[PDB]
Nucleic acid binder design. Structure first.
Ligand SMILES: O=c1ccn([C@@H]2O[C@H](COP(=O)(O)OP(=O)(O)OP(=O)(O)O)[C@@H](O)[C@H]2O)c(=O)[nH]1
Ligand SMILES: [Mg+2]
Ligand SMILES: [Mg+2]
Lengths: 49, 48, 269, 48, 48, 279, 98, 134, 48, 49, 147
RNA sequence: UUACU
């Protein structure tokens, strides 16, 4: 029960913001989003360092 | 209307090589068919 | 001619009362920049609610975790818009009007103009519609100065290059612009390997108000670039941000509570 | 009401004239983003 | 009308939503009869 | 037929339109191919009336110190042009006009960078420029071209756009240091006190190179944009002590001067004097 | 049959770039679990079509339940309008997940 | 999401490390630009405040000390310099590559090249294909 | 020889394929044994 | 000899279209650096017994 | 001083095998090039038997180590620009919240929907590949299954 | 004596 400030408590809500109120990079085309048409994303590849 | 027409098109011509330019049908694959006597018009046989 | 109107706490401010024909050239940039409002939420709220729905956005994100909130006024946003900064709205109003087909609009008609095509020598006649013609003329022609007849002096005239804020598009030209600069930042930051980490942003020009999320270091790396690109756009953003503090349309929201600003309603002036 | 659009005089005259015009640039469709989710989505099929 | 009939009754929607759909499908019937007299007499001589 | 471009150059500048997309590319070594009589072209009802505001504010005794602001490129050849348009307006108005000759900030600030109280008088400004005093920006530009080491015009062609454009961005930051505040050596103080102080003429004509000098020139409702019969970058390889310093700054100023004002076409200002009804 | 709907749609991916990097792993074969497959070059989405056949079961469980409590056609059809509204919002975002 | 109150939590307002550096610069300007009794009323509200409700008590009350609601009216020749004079804060904004121009050399179609505007048209130019149907 | 060679793949159409040897397969007007509903809807797109 | 792209009025319009990024670099384009995986050994010069 | 040298030279791995530690901590099918320093720049191999043996003492004596590992994994997700929140709600289709007969439904969607925190969505994604040192447990969903 | 959203 040693919680790590909200780590072990799993909230299975958290599929409703994933399903609705989030914009994704590969959803912002077509889209389908708050783009509101088609615009761009230029996918970010994060650095290893 | 001529110069206006002439202007409209209106500046690029020097891309196509015009060495022995003929008018031939192609296959939808992309090979140039020969002159077929019974499909093409008479004026496409020898582009004079 | 310079109309003057004053507010509760701002200094004595002037705005330009345009006649019907100078109002006419600004109208097609007003109608083009109007339809971005229905398209993008974040081109945002008009104040029809009166009650809690004008703040029901700001009451929610302040109630959340790991958020820093910035609320930006640029300082003076009539001045700053030089003619060159004004041009960023002019491309958007042009580039809509070419793909469109508007016949006649007013005292125009879709006709056959001589158009120079850069990297062509020689004029080649495109077909332009009336929206195109009108917008080009208005964009070209723009006189900005306000001229006030004085009882002291003869006729004092403002040195132009401001934004003559009465034209038609005085609410869209500062909305469509700042929407392009802050949202366009998270394309440019995504273009070179940095994340975006910005949630919903509400722009009623000039009042910018964006909402960030992540660690306390990630959001700040974005919060500087939203300042620094507005700093390099020729704008004096004043400076405001905080964790749990947010303002928009002179209505403070904090901690999930609503603070009033009671003194702005002067009962007796 | 989402599909139907105001009857601009300029493009009804264009769609008639495109029918017997020669096609040189290959035409392409406006990107219709519909779902075909509800049984009210037959309006797109009646459009076609 | 029979295609939208099967899709409405497979997914058990209202009696009124199926009726107000089919009342719309025959409002396009009335409007098509009123203008086909003008298409097939005056548009068709222009395409000729 | 087939005389050069410098023979009767003065009449062609006063009355010509080079109907070609800029860069047209005519030069002082260019000759004539053919001549045919053509219709007298008609001036610009949208650009006649903007210039007609200044030709009303010069007339009325109401408006104190009207001002005409003329933007062009660095090689449009307007200091040789609007020196005689002062001579066409003052003889028609019966007043005294004087053009500030467009570089008189740059010639003057090089002379007194150092001086705590400078002389803002009108007679001191005009007895200073054209040409022997170097401009201040041509000192700054001159130092800058060196740092990305370059001294030849043909070497400037070898440089290309984004590697060039970063040099232009570096060139700007010495611009804004004279535009931002109203210090005692800034641009805003110079075009104010020259325009106010009683020794000056009633209706000066300033000329600006780059746009967003509009917050500095003062004060007017009439800013025009001059497009002469001159491929201006050809005239900067002409200039005949041009070098790269003249040609870098035309390029820098074209990056700061778009056509967001009324193009004015130098025969139309000579046309509007004539139309106006005088006393 | 309802507990068959909880099965994952993924694959057991081996850690090839961890062993060659000689990184520490607390098992013999390091086999982490990816939740869903990559979906290039396809018209339909094989992960978003799994959710089509789950709601095709769940809109029949809620339909067999609501007719047993003989409730309204209006209160039941508006539920089934929402169950296929999850279909439209799943087909949009499963392109970015997979 | 749908603005009803669902919970209460205790969330600790300590503004982060980089705005604590803006406190040192601002409190020096608080000391000299203000009347010292108005300043001493403020410095008690920093120190005495114990709840989030308590800062709200002082803030609306310190706000009405800086305003009288009087609309600030003079003759507008005095405020022409202050209000609508154009300022250039620091940078110049550069111009577009003009692609098309009509018979007079003026902007007809134009595109941005690596500026501040090119950041803006990276977002905005996507809408020109849809708004042209609205 | 005049046969129809169906591809057997599930591809999104593009107008690049309009100049090639591929056709849209909804408009084959060939009755598939087991798909007599989709083909019957495609008999409504015939011209008149 | 220039026609006509060396003039900046036509060069600036042909760089908004297809903006050039890549330059000729006949070496190896270093963009990242790597730290050692374990600072394990000290590197003294004259050892003491 | 000879044991420390006979491990640094006979391990036969170089500084060029630091690249294999970069192909793991970056995206799949990335490509690295150069510099090919060769055997003039040697290095120990990454000690496999020791680190996995001391992560099992660190997991036993320090059960907060899951907070270290997840914070690294959360920091990769938020730096990847992979899922970002937004203000627009589309939980319901066009005119269903306004519909009267579905008021029993929308009072359970909003009621569920309202709590889960954002950006615990950013956190969770880091739970689908972290180690487990504390046993996770469910946030109490007290329901009745009546309607 | 007086602007637009
Ligand atoms: O009557 C009004 C009032 C306000 N506005 C609005 O004013 C905006 C420009 O005004 P600013 O909002 O930029 O003024 P400022 O904040 O920089 O001034 P300070 O607070 O710093 O003192 C414009 O973008 C516009 O939309 C009007 O157009 N008309
Ligand atoms: Mg403001
Ligand atoms: Mg404001």
């Amino acid at each position: 029960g040693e919680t790590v400030d909200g780590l072990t408590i799993i909230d299975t809500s958290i599929v409703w913001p994933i399903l609705c109120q989030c914009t994704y990079p590969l959803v912002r085309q077509s889209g389908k989003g708050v783009d509101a048409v088609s615009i761009m994303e230029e996918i970010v590849y994060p650095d290893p360092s | 209307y001529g110069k206006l027409t002439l202007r409209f098109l209106g500046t690029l011509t020097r891309s196509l090589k015009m060495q022995n330019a003929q008018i031939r049908r192609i296959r939808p694959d992309g090979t140039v068919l020969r002159y077929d006597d019974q499909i093409d018009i008479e004026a496409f046989r020898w582009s004079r | 001619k310079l109309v003057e109107r004053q507010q509760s706490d701002r200094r004595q401010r002037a705005i330009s009362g345009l006649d019907n024909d100078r109002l006419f050239l600004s109208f097609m940039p007003y109608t083009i920049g109007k339809q971005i409002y229905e398209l993008n939420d974040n081109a945002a709220q008009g104040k029809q609610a009166g009650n809690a729905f004008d703040i029901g956005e700001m009451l929610y994100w302040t109630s959340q975790r790991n958020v820093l909130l910035s609320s930006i006024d640029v300082a003076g946003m009539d001045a700053s818009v030089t003619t060159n900064t004004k041009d960023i709205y002019n491309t958007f109003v042009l580039d809509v009007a070419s793909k469109c087909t508007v016949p006649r609009f007013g005292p125009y008609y879709a006709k056959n103009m001589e158009v120079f095509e850069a990297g062509n020598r020689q004029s080649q006649v495109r077909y332009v519609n009336a929206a195109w013609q009108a917008c080009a003329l208005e964009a070209a022609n723009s006189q900005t100065s306000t001229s006030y007849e004085s009882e002291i002096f003869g006729q004092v005239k403002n040195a132009e290059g401001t934004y003559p804020s009465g034209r038609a598009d005085t609410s869209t030209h500062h909305t469509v612009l700042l929407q392009g600069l802050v949202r366009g930042n998270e394309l440019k930051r995504a273009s070179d390997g940095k994340n975006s980490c910005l949630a919903t942003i509400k722009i009623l020009g000039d009042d910018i108000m964006e909402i960030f999320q992540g660690s306390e270091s990630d959001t700040y790396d974005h919060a500087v670039s939203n300042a620094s690109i507005l700093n390099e756009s020729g704008f004096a953003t004043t400076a405001e941000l905080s964790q749990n503090s947010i303002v928009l349309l002179q209505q403070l929201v904090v901690n999930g509570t609503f603070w009033g600003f009671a003194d702005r309603i002067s009962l007796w002036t | 009401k989402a599909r139907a659009s105001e009857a601009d005089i300029s493009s009804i005259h264009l769609a008639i004239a495109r029918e017997v015009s020669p096609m040189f640039n290959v035409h392409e469709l406006k990107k219709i983003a519909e779902s075909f989710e509800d049984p009210s989505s037959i309006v797109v099929v009646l459009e076609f | 009308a029979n295609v939208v009939n099967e899709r409405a009754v497979q997914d058990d929607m209202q009696k009124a939503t199926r009726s107000c759909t089919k009342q719309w499908l025959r409002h396009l019937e009335t409007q098509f009869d009123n203008i086909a007299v003008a298409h097939t007499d005056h548009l068709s001589v222009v395409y000729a | 037929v087939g005389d050069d471009y410098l023979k009767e150059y003065k009449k062609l500048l006063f009355y010509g339109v080079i109907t070609d997309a800029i860069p047209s590319g005519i030069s002082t070594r260019s000759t004539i191919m053919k001549i045919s009589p053509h219709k007298m072209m008609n001036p610009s009802g949208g650009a006649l009336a903007v210039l007609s505001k200044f030709l009303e504010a010069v007339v009325s005794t109401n408006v104190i110190n009207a001002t005409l602001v003329v933007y062009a490129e660095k090689g449009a050849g307007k200091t040789s042009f609007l020196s005689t348009y002062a001579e066409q307006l003052s003889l028609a108005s019966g007043q005294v006009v004087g053009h500030l000759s467009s570089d008189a900030y740059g010639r003057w600030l090089a002379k007194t960078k150092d001086i705590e109280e400078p002389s803002f008088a009108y007679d001191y400004v005009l007895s200073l420029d054209t040409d022997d005093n170097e401009s201040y920006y041509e000192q700054k530009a001159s130092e800058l071209l060196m740092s990305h080491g370059i001294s030849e015009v043909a070497q400037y062609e070898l440089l290309s756009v984004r590697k060039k454009i970063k040099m232009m961005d570096e060139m700007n930051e010495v611009l804004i240091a004279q535009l931002e505040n109203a210090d005692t050596h800034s641009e805003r103080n110079f075009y104010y006190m020259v325009s106010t102080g009683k020794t000056t003429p009633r209706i000066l004509i300033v000329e600006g190179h780059f746009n967003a000098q509009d917050a500095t020139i003062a004060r007017t409702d009439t800013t025009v944009l001059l497009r002469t019969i001159n491929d201006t970058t050809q005239a900067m390889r002409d200039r005949q002590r041009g070098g790269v310093v003249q040609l870098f700054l035309r390029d820098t100023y074209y990056r700061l001067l778009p056509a967001l004002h009324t193009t004015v076409y130098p025969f139309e200002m000579l046309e509007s004097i004539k139309r106006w009804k005088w006393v | 049959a309802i507990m068959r709907l909880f099965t994952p749609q993924g694959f057991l991916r081996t850690d090839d770039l961890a062993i060659a990097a000689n990184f520490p792993r607390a098992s013999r074969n390091p086999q982490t679990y990816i939740p869903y497959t990559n979906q290039r070059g396809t018209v339909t989405n094989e992960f978003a079509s799994r959710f089509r056949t789950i709601v095709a079961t769940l809109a029949n469980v809620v339909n067999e339940r609501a007719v047993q409590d003989d409730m309204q056609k209006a209160t039941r059809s508006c539920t089934k309008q929402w169950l296929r509204h999850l279909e439209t919002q799943f087909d949009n975002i499963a392109v970015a997940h997979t | 999401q749908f603005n009803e109150v669902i919970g209460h939590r205790t969330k600790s307002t300590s503004e982060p490390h980089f705005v604590s550096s803006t406190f040192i610069s601002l409190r020096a300007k608080r000391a000299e630009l203000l009347y010292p009794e108005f300043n001493a009323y403020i410095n008690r509200a920093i120190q005495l405040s114990k709840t989030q409700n308590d800062v709200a008590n002082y803030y609306a009350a310190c706000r009405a000390m800086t305003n009288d609601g009087t609309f600030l009216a003079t003759l507008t020749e005095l405020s022409l310099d202050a209000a609508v004079f154009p300022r250039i804060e620091q940078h110049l904004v550069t111009r577009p590559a003009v692609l098309m121009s009509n018979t007079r050399h003026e902007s007809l179609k134009q595109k941005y090249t690596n500026g501040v505007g090119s950041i803006a048209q990276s977002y905005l130019s996507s809408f020109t294909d849809e708004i042209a149907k609205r | 020889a005049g046969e129809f060679e169906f591809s057997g793949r599930n591809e999104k159409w593009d107008q690049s394929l309009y100049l090639s040897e591929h056709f849209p397969a909804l408009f084959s007007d060939v009755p598939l044994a087991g798909a007599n509903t989709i083909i019957a809807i495609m008999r409504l797109f015939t011209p008149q | 000899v220039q026609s006509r792209t060396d003039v900046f009025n036509e060069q600036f319009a042909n760089e908004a279209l297809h903006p050039m990024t890549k330059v000729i670099f006949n070496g190896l384009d270093v963009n990242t650096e790597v730290q050692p995986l374990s600072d394990d050994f000290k590197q003294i010069s004259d050892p003491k017994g | 001083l000879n044991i420390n040298l006979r491990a640094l030279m006979e391990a036969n791995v170089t500084a060029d095998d630091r690249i294999k530690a970069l192909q793991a901590h970056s995206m799949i099918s990335t490509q690295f090039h150069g510099p090919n320093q060769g055997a003039l720049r040697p290095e120990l191999a990454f000690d496999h038997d020791h680190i996995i043996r001391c992560l099992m003492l660190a997991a036993a004596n320090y059960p907060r180590l899951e907070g270290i590992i997840v914070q690294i994994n959360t920091g990769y997700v938020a730096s990847a620009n992979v899922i970002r929140p937004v203000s627009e709600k589309r939980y319901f289709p066009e005119n269903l919240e306004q519909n009267q007969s579905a008021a029993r439904l929308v009072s359970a969607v909003k009621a569920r929907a309202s709590e889960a925190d954002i950006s615990s969505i950013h956190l969770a994604i880091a739970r689908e590949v972290s180690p487990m040192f504390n046993v996770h447990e469910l946030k109490k969903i007290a329901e009745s299954f009546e309607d």
